[PDB]
Design a binder for these strands. Sequence first.
DNA 1: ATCGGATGTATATATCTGACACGTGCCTGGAGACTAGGGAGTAATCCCCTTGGCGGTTAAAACGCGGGGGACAGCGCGTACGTGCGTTTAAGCGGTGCTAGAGCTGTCTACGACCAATTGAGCGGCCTCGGCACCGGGATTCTCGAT
DNA 2: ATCGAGAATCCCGGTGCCGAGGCCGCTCAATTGGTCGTAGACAGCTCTAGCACCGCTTAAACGCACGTACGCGCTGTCCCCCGCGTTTTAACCGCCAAGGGGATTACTCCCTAGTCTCCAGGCACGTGTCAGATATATACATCCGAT
Lengths: 148, 108, 109, 85, 76, 93, 94, 83, 82, 99, 99
Amino acid sequence: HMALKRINKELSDLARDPPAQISAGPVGDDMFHWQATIMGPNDSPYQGGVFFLTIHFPTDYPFKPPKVAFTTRIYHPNINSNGSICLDILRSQWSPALTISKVLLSIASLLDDPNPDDPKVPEIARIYKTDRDKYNRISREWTQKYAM
Amino acid sequence: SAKACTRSSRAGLQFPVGRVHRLLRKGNYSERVGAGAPVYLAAVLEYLTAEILELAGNAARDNKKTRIIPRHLQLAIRNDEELNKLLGRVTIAQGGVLPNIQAVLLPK
Amino acid sequence: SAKACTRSSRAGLQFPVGRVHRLLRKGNYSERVGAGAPVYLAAVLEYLTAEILELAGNAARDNKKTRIIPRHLQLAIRNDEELNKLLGRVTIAQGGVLPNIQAVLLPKK
Amino acid sequence: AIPSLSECQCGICMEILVEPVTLPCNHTLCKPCFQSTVEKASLCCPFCRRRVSSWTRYHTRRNSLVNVELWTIIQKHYPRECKLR
Amino acid sequence: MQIFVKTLTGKTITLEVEPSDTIENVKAKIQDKEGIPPDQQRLIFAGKQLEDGRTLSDYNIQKESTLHLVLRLRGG
Amino acid sequence: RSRKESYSIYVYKVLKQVHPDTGISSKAMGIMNSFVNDIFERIAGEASRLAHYNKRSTITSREIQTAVRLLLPGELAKHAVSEGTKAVTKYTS
Amino acid sequence: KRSRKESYSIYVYKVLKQVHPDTGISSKAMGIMNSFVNDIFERIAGEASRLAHYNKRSTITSREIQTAVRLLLPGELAKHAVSEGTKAVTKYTS
Amino acid sequence: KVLRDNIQGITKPAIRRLARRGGVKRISGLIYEETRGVLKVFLENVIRDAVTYTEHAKRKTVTAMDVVYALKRQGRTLYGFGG
Amino acid sequence: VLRDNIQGITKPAIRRLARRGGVKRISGLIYEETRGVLKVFLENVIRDAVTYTEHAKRKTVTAMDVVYALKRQGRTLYGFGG
Amino acid sequence: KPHRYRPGTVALREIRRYQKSTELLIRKLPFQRLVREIAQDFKTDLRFQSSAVMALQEACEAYLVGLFEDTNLCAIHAKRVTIMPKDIQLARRIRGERA
Amino acid sequence: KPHRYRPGTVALREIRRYQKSTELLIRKLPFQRLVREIAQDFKTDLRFQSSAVMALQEACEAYLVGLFEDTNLCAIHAKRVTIMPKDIQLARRIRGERA
DNA sequence: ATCGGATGTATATATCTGACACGTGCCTGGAGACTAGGGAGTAATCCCCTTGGCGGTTAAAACGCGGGGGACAGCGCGTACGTGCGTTTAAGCGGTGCTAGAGCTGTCTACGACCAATTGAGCGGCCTCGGCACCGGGATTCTCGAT
DNA sequence: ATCGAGAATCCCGGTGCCGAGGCCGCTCAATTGGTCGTAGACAGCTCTAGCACCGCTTAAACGCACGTACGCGCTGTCCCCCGCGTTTTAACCGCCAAGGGGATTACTCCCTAGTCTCCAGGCACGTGTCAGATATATACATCCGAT
Ligand SMILES: [Zn+2]
Ligand SMILES: [Zn+2]
C-alpha cells in the first residue's frame, strides 16, 4: 500500500546518487524482493571479493526492519555460514527514518571490522581476538576461491 | 522472529525473559506457565522502570546534579499523578516531602 | 488416636479434615502440605465460627426470635471488640447500623 | 515566516502532514506516522532518539497533541494538497 | 577408507579418510570438500559425541561406518 | 447437573452444639459460609508466604500457628492457638 | 565464598543508560529500584494467579497478564503497558 | 435505546434517609449534588473492574461473583452473595 | 532493663516533625498525645517483627523482618531490600 | 389550633426509626437504570443479573452511610450541627480516597 | 533596640527549611533505646541489626509526618491555626486507626 | 413548676403462608495400603557483625522572661432549612412471551512439562579517579520599625 | 502608600575524599535438543432466566406556605506560645576489644506425593408444618402550650 511509494522514492534516490562500492537492484518484477552486490573495502583483507545478498521487505515499511540474507557465503565473526547477520541497528534499534542505503553502509562497515560485544560465533571471535595472523591466513585463502 | 539467539534480544527488551520465566514457574503462582507470559511481564516491568527513570533524570537535571538520589525519585514519583496514584502506599527511604504550605498560614 | 475412625472424629473436630487437606494441596499454596496443617486450620475455623454463632444466637434470643438473621450477625460482630477489629473492612448484606446518636444532637434540658 | 513546501513535507512518509504533532525535540511529523510508530515501532522519535513516553502520556489525557496553529497555516497555504487527503 | 556421513538436510557424503587422521584433520577435510565449518560440526557415531582431541581410531570406526552430522546454528 | 460444595451442614452442626434450639435462615448460612471461606483464604495465604519467606517448601503446623498469631487479635489468637494445639495433640494419638 | 544473590542492578543500569546517556545512579536509588520492581512483579503475578484460578484454569497465559495489568495500573499507564506488551509478544512470536 | 441523565433518579428524600441512617440531624441544601457526584465516581470505579472481569471470561452477562470480586479487590469485602 | 525512655523523644523533635508536616502554631498539650500514638505504632510494628524473627528460630531482628512487618500492614517500605 | 412539632424532634424520631430498620433505602428501578447507563459506557449491550445489581446497591448504601457518619463527625467537630459539602470534602481527603 | 522578628515569621522559615531537606529528625540513641525497651518487653535477650532500627525510625518519621499533615488540615478546617489533641484524635478516628 | 391534650409508639391476639428442617437415592470424592526419594533435621565449623567501653567536643536541649497575636466567650441578625399539607408521578406487583446466552458434553490437536549437556551471562572482588561535600568570601534578598 | 539597617540566604571558587563505573576471574543455570501426557479450543446441544411488554394500584415524590433557630460576623478580653539569650547535658565520632550466633557443609532418615482399589458423606430433590409477617384493637411514653 503506502510502503511501495516509499520504496519507489528510496530507489529513485538510490539511482540518482548511487553510493560508491555498493550496488542494488530489483531481483524480480515484484517490488518487495531486492538483490544487492557488495565488494570489500580497500583497507580490509577481503580484496577482490564480490558478494551477492538478497533482501526481503516486510508487509509494512519502514516500521519493521527489512530481512536481509547472504545467498553467498562469508567467513566473518559476526555472520553465520547460512547468511544470518547480527547487526545492532538492523534489529535492536531499527528506526523508520533510516534508509536501506545506510543499512548497506553499515554492512560494509561491519565487513571492515567485527564487533567484540555481540559475536555471532564465539569461537571465531576468540580466534580474531587471540591474535591477528591465524585469522589472516584463513581469510586470505578464503577470499579468492569463493568470490571467484 | 528468527530463533537461535538469546530470548531477551528476540523481544527487543532488556530485562531477562528467562529469569522472569523461572520466577513465574517456581513462585507457586500456577501449575503451568505459558510461553508468552514472561515476555509480557518483562515488557511491562521495563516500561515502568524506564518511565520512572526518565522523570528521575529530569528532576536530577533540574537540581543541577548528575546523579540519581532518593530525593529525585521521590520528586519524580510524587509530582506526577498516575505514578502517585499507583505508588500511593509506599514510602521511599530518605525521600522527604514535597514543599507545600497552606495559603491560610501565609502572612497578610 | 485409634487410627480407625474418621479423621474429623479422630481429631474430635466437627469441621472436615479431608476437604481442608485437599483445598490446601490443590489451592496453589505450596508444593507440599504437612500432615497436621489441615487439623490446625479446621480447629481454628471451628473456634471462630462457634464464637460468632454463639454471639449471634445470644443476640437473637435477646430479641425474642428463634432464628438467626443477618441483622443479628451484624449486631454480634459490631458489639464485640475483637470480632469488630478482625472484620473491620467487611460489609454484611442487609446488616444495618448500630444505633447511636451523638451527645451534642440530643435536645437540651 | 513562510511554511514553504520542501521543509513542509513529513520526514517519514514523504507526504502532506495530517494533524501534525510537535515532539518535545521540536520534531514535526504527520499524525499517521506517529500513530504507526506507537503500535509498530520503538515509541521513541526516530531522528534524535529520545524517549517521549511521559510527554505523550501527559498530553493524550487532555488531547493536546495536535498543533492547531500549524494546521491552520497548512490549510490556508495548501488547500489543494489537503483536500486530496 | 570410505565412510558415510548423513546430515540434517538429507545429504549423504562419502569421505575417503584413514583412521590415522584425527578429528581436527577430518573436520578440515570435510570443510574443504563440503564447506561446513568444523566448529559447527558435531559428530555422532553409535549415538555418542566425538571429541576433537582424541583420534578417530579411538572410536574403533571401521570401513563404511555411519556418522551423523549436527549443525549448531547460533545467532539469528 | 453439577455439584457445588459448601460448609452448610458443618455450620449447622456447630450451631446445634452451641445452641440446641435456635435456627438459622438461608442468608445467614450464606454469610457464615463466605466468612469461613475468607478466613481460610487469609490463613492459607499467610502460611504460604511465611513458607516462601524462609526458603522452605512445606506447610506444617507451626506456619499455620504463626499465621494465626499474626492475623488474629490477642485473646482470639491465644484461644485459637490453644484449640489448634489441643486438636493436633489429640489427632496425633 | 558468599552465595550468589540475584538482583536487577545491571538491567536497571542498562535502561537508565538507554534513557539518559550521561546520568549516573547511586546505590540507594538502585535499592529503591529493585524494591519497586519486586513489588510490581509480586502484584502482577498474584493478580494473574487469582484471576486464572477464578476461571477454573491451570495456566497463566499472556491474557491473564494483560488483564492483571489492566486492573492494577491507572488509566493511561495501563493502556501504554498493554500496547508495549503487545509490542514485545508480537515481535517475539514472528 | 440509549439512556440519558438518570443520575437524577437518586432522589433528595433518598439522600435524606441515608443521612438519617448515618446519624445526621440537620442537612444543608448543597449536600445532594456532592452526594450524587461521589456516588457516580464510586459506581464508575466498581463497574469498570466488574466489566473487565466479565470481559476476560469471554462472557456477556456480569454476575454477582464478578461484582463481589471487584469489590473485594477494590478494598471493600462483601458478604452474603457467595464468595 | 530500661525504664521511662519515651521521654527521649523530646519537644524539639516533635516540633521539627510538625514543621516538616507544615504547621505554624503548636499547642503545649500535644506532645504527650504524639508520644502516645508513636508508642502505639512502635508496639504494633515490633510485635509482628518479633513474631517473624521468632518463627525463623533466630535471635536477631534483621531488616527483612521489619520490612515484611510493614508490608503486612499496608505500609510498604522501599530502600532496605524487599 | 393546629399542632406541629418543634423543628429537630421528628428528625430525631426519623433517625431512631431508620437506624433500627434494615431495608434498602434507594429505590430499585432508578438505581438499576443508573447502573446500566454507567456500564454501557465501557462496553456495549451488556446484560445484568439481578444479584449483581442487588450487591452493587448494597455496597452503595454501606459506603454512603459510612461517608455520612464521617461527615457528621466533622460537622460536630467544627462546632456546628449542619453538615456541608466542605465537610464531605475533608472527610474524603483524610481517608485518602481523593488525595 | 535589638532586632526581634515578629512572632510568626520564624515558623514559616523553619517550614521552608525542613520541607526542603531529607535528613532524619529524631535522635538516634534515644530512639534505639526506646525500640530496645519495647522489644525486651515483648521478648528477652534480643539483638538488632542497624538496618532494623533504621527502617523502624524511617517508618515512624513518615507516619508522624502524615499524621501532623492531617492534623493541620483538621485544624485549618476548624477555623483555627493552632493544632490541638482533639484534631489528632479526629484524624486518627476518620483514618480508621482507632474507631 | 405541672397540668391536659395529642401524637406516636408499645403491647396483646387471630391467621395463614412460604421457607426451613428433614427423609431419600447415589456417586464422586474421601479413605486405606505400599514405596521410593528428596526435603528437612542434626552436628561441627568459620568469621562476620553485634555488643560493651572510654575520651573529647560541641551541637543540641533545657530554663527563663517579655509580649503580641490568637482562642474563646458573648450579642445580634436574617436567612436558609425544617415541618406540614394538597397534588402530580412513577415505582411496585402480577402475569405472559421469547430467545440470547450460560452451561455441559465429545474430539483431538498443539502447547507445555522433563532430562542431559553445554557453555556464556551474570555475580564476587579490586581499583582508580571524578563528582559531590565542605569552607571561605561576597552579592542578593526578605523583614520591620518609622516615617 | 515608602527609606534603610540588621539579618538570612544564594553564587562562586578552591580543596579534598570515597564510592561507583569498569575490568577480571569464575561457577551455575539458561539454552537446545527431543519426547510424551493432557488442556483447552472448538462444535453442538440444552434449557434458564433476562429482557420486553401490558395493566392496576397507591406509596412515595413534589411544590408551596410559614415559622424559627443557628451560621456567621463582629467585638472584647486575657493568656499562653514564641522569639531570644544563657546554661547545662549527653549525642556523636573515633577507637579498641571480646564473643554470639548467622551462615555454611556433610550426613542421614523418614514424610509424603504418587498409584490403585473400595465404599459412604454429602448433594440434588422432594415434602411437611409452623414462625412469623400482617392485621386489629388497647395501653402507655413523650412532646408542646400554659400556667
Ligand atoms: Zn508522515
Ligand atoms: Zn527527536
